[PDB]
Amino acid sequence: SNKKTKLIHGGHTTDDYTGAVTTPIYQTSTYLQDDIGDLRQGYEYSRTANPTRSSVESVIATLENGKHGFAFSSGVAAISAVVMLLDKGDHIILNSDVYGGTYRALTKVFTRFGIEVDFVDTTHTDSIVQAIRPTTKMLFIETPSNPLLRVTDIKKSAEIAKEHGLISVVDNTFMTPYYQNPLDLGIDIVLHSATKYLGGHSDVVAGLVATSDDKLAERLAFISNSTGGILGPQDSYLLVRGIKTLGLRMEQINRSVIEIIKMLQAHPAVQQVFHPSIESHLNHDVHMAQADGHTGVIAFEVKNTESAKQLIKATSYYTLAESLGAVESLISVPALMTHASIPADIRAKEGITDGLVRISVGIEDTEDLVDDLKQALDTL
Amino acid sequence: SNKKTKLIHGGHTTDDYTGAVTTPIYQTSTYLQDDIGDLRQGYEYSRTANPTRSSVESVIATLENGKHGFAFSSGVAAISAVVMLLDKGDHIILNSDVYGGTYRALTKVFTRFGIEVDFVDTTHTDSIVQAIRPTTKMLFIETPSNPLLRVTDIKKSAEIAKEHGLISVVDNTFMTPYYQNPLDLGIDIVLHSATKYLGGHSDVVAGLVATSDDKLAERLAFISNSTGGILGPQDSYLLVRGIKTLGLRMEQINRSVIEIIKMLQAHPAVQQVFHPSIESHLNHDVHMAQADGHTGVIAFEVKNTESAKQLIKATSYYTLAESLGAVESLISVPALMTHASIPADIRAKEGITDGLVRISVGIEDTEDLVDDLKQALDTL
Amino acid sequence: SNKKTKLIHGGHTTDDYTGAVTTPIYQTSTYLQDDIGDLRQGYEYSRTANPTRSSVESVIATLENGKHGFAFSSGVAAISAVVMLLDKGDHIILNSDVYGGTYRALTKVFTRFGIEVDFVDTTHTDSIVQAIRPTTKMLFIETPSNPLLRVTDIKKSAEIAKEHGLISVVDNTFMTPYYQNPLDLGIDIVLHSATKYLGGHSDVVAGLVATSDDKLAERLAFISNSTGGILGPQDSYLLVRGIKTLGLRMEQINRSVIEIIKMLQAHPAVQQVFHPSIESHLNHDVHMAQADGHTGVIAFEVKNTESAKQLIKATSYYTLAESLGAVESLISVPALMTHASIPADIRAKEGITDGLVRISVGIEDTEDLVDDLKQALDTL
Amino acid sequence: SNKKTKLIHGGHTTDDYTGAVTTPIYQTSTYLQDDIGDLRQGYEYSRTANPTRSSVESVIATLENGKHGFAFSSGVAAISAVVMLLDKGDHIILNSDVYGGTYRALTKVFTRFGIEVDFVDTTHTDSIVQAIRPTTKMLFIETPSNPLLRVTDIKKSAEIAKEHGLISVVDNTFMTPYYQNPLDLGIDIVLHSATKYLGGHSDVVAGLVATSDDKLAERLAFISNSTGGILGPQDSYLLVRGIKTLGLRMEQINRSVIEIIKMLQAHPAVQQVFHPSIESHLNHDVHMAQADGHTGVIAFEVKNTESAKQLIKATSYYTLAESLGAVESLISVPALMTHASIPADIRAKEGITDGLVRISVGIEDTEDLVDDLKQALDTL
């Protein structure tokens, strides 16, 4: 019924055999056959299917209102499996602000296989219509984007993809299924770095994919079984466990996001602030119409790299590390860390400047997070 | 010094920090940075590197006498990462009876990416020389192959690859590093389904790759980080643990293999046996020159499908399941299981006859395994 | 600073060596020594100490404002270790409403070792003063109690224990350190079934003990090392992970508790309701003074066993199972399940009747939990 | 049939539900009930029973030819559960060189509970008969003992226990079920530190108990459920896995033991060797009659403390650490490590001399272990 209930009881995460209230961890590679080809419960080889992986796959399918879920060894592995739906000579359109690893995978791996890529400013969806070539087969969107939180109209993107015969993909990592459900808006495939919010505890690297399209699901299952980027059973289990608290965690994070943004907008050492909740933010109305909450990722400008480093050293509760969506609050400078692989001239033009700080708000106390960041900013 | 000692003390499998005699399980996604880019021990994000995965990578590098190891979420994922060393338009030669998953990855995924393939019978290495084009970049061989245990000259394949500028790859799953070391014989890259003997306990799906080539290692590390088919920390740990007993397990398996083959050759219900230890086996001398032991996979032909099925039902200690390299002895009928898509009128041409049985010998008592298979054969 | 921050950053739950932001899982039994008796990080044998166990021990010590923490294989193992502080001939006073397993351990195991036990109604603390014998060495209190939520004044109990030379113990399972901190009120030892709220995810059986008393800590460490009821490293890790979300979970649970109790008090099929938040509940003022929230365990009376069974079968979101403090809402009938080991005549006199239902409120949506239980009660 | 087969196929270590060839890891605390008291597969709460723990319990029962198995959080916890079979005033006889932790549990915990103890030299079983009182209820023996490998007649101890109405217990850690089966010789209860050989990989702390006596099993199950020193599911799984290779590991260890002893007896720097395989060892004939192999623990005397320390520093393949039964060969000096509390002037009386070295032989190559220890001895 309501989302917090669906998080606990949606999907298949109990044991039918013993009645155990959590998913057993099937640390196993193969399964006894009663007769040649007769599988007790449909399992024959864990790369093809594993019951704990099946559990987390059923969870992600349920939460995104899809029919089929797939668990991969990492988010980039989910992305690579989706890109392998295409052949040499196919073209894919992506939004122009994208995760550094997605940029690197597409431009340094898949272009070697003849897959053509254009990064387009999808914050106006008619840009997509101009960018469509006769060879375009896929439209791939992050919203909000990493790290500038650019917002793209999901429903309009889906309509464009349907009209032009494209596979539409949304990377829904930043919003989670708790706040934004691209499949409900006509998107073909939705995917996640489950490394971030879904796992939620900085202890699993994993990717998740969901679709309602039977033929896309069959093609993805074939790719996963043939290239083998599958999530292991222990990580699958820890993902199910982490997902249990996703709603509580996202709601704490959102409460903190609101206050932190107020502080940041008022602070003299802070210039521009990037977050879809700010009403002057481009496509703020689009975000409010396609999501009912916010990501915990915030970007904001300080003067320069050296102020950014001072800010990082003055905080007590923000941890300098990669990733986002942890219970711990994280801080980074994308131009020097996660987005160093994006060329510097494109970084400068897009606004990923040397003094752009990114924070992932965690689930610490709101007043502590605001006060800590504010006194650190006061140090400058 | 000797192999059984190297298995215990090779690689880095203790904790330098606490002194723990086993590798800690780093169930973690990210690592605190003391300053931007300043990593205490070189770790920043578990997809890029994870200390438990690094442990198992050091083990496989040591055991294969290489410099660099890589752990992937499956053997198929290791194979796919190695094939992604190539670009659209490059050509690769493989043995024609290569593992079905390798066949499917190449012909149903990578040919869509413009990679050209020739499948040749490599038991005569001039087959390889005939297939070489100006575009050939890679030579990929299993030895011995499945399920007929065809043997390929590793030293000559390496010489061919060196002379023509190819990256040579050996899938050494069936022999393990305990008996055959392709890198010592001039091969560029060696890889394993660690799902089989290396893990040894039918409880991990995993791939391992080793090389001594710094630039190949740099390229593989880039592919692994960008497409993300990495092995998780729990599975890496179980791999290190399983590998500890690899020599004891392989030696037990080999004693049973020898006695079982003696039984099979004497039995009236058996028309033919396939195993490289048999002196009339093709390239027996080649195998004895490049390996100092044997795989536990044996194939043998009985009268028909129904005799094969009877054999499965009459054994007490042979388990009907997919995979190989378990502690349990496993039994299968390739024409009904792994090769069912190949037609009956055509089966004879490839050698996958209706009465072809494959066993993966486990570590049960030799006398029990011999006696059990023998009395089952006596029921025919 | 504030509790939600302390939950994330309190205790030592990162890796000093690699910087990993979560506690490594030291699946290990022993530790290399650089010289005889020289321990790299103080570890020599995992039963004596294990770094992952040390992590969860530091967490529980921090959260209860103690100096020493101890992790046991179960709550009853924590309780048995604490009872083994006493000798044959010592006497212990417990409150008269206690967990069924605690009753069974004391009356069927430890009385065989000459430890004398009286269960006293501690809801008036002067009862304790009358019950003190010359041999009384320990005072052991649950508050609120299981399953009737009787409340005992912790501070007054501690004053009595100090004045009469008793070791005071509070079983703080139901309140968690998030709402009630017995050590701050003068109690010597605080303990938990970490199986319940602390782990929070129905996937760990564990006990935790905390004290500020150096000599009690030394005696407990000796008992734990000599009788060996230690928590394993994987369970220790899952406990740390679960504890991360304790504040969010308890706050959701408390929001639901308030509404569910309103519904239950208004419902015609429900007679008496047991929960410390109800202002007519005995020692409601005492509870509000020693805790700043509520447990999620509620007991209430329906007509009889058969109405209780009907109620259980009519709910959609309440799971019939043992334990409490899960993310899933649980329902039980204590007289038939957890408290069957308490004799029936004592059950009837104390109010643990055949129609007494116990619910553990989980973290599902409040409106769903209220509506589901209400329509189920309407079925009667 | 034969032992190596029984190790693989004995006990229940597959999943009946999915057919998984390994035991699922039930990381869970509680189980859904279809109706109050109606359990799908007999599970209601993981302290009482857990399916992964039940798997390892069935394994130890099978391997020791018993009916009932019990898994505890440590060997010391198994020992404590067995001792809690007694009441205040009961008397127990143990061999006088019993494991230090057993000595401490009995003399520093259980004597405070009114249990009376005699420590006697059991290498002559009439020692036992002399110590029997009317209050004697239990006889508890290790064979062979640590670190001098004293041998005790199991059959005669069982006859003594039967004649006088005692519960007989054998701590069979050093021999494992692979070589010695006390229950077959009339003993009531057999137990193990599974931390050592059974786990085999220095990565689990665990205890195991087996019996054929239904009423003893009922009493043990009650003690385990009420004091809660249960083994967790992850450790139970790692135990099942490690036990798979127990026979291969013990046989390798035994080959190395034989050759190493040949070396030690010939060496001028060695005054004396302690191991039951030596024909002049006390009760060598008794050991050969009750066991069909040997432990890997060997002790031998060199000149003094400084020669022992030199020996440790000169070895390449012997690791300085606590515990025994690793895949690594371990080396220790009992007078400086396990027996340091015993005074120097008194050391001689017990036989723990200053130059007494203990090694636990691992599964490294026999020639390496012999050569390494020999060249180290040559440095003296």
Ligand SMILES: *Cc1c(COP(=O)(O)O)cnc(C)c1O
């Ligand atoms: C409510 C609920 C659903 C359905 O949720 P929708 O928002 O209607 O898709 C599915 N599963 C569970 C467990 C639920 O509680």
Ligand SMILES: *Cc1c(COP(=O)(O)O)cnc(C)c1O
């Ligand atoms: C013997 C040994 C080696 C070297 O083995 P080679 O086959 O000679 O390369 C490496 N590491 C360890 C731990 C060894 O014992």
Ligand SMILES: *Cc1c(COP(=O)(O)O)cnc(C)c1O
């Ligand atoms: C605030 C805080 C503490 C201290 O909490 P008290 O309530 O003063 O005992 C300890 N550790 C961390 C991480 C904190 O944030």
Ligand SMILES: *Cc1c(COP(=O)(O)O)cnc(C)c1O
């Ligand atoms: C042989 C065998 C047994 C019986 O072993 P005994 O020593 O004769 O009791 C039991 N279980 C399995 C799986 C066996 O192979």
Ligand code: NA
């Ligand atoms: Na469910």
Ligand code: NA
């Ligand atoms: Na659709």
Ligand code: NA
């Ligand atoms: Na090493």
Ligand code: NA
């Ligand atoms: Na071709």
Ligand code: NA
């Ligand atoms: Na040619």
Ligand code: NA
């Ligand atoms: Na080379």
Ligand code: NA
């Ligand atoms: Na911390």
Ligand code: NA
């Ligand atoms: Na105090």
Ligand code: NA
């Ligand atoms: Na079996």
Ligand code: NA
């Ligand atoms: Na005595």
Ligand code: NA
């Ligand atoms: Na006497």
Ligand code: NA
């Ligand atoms: Na008996």
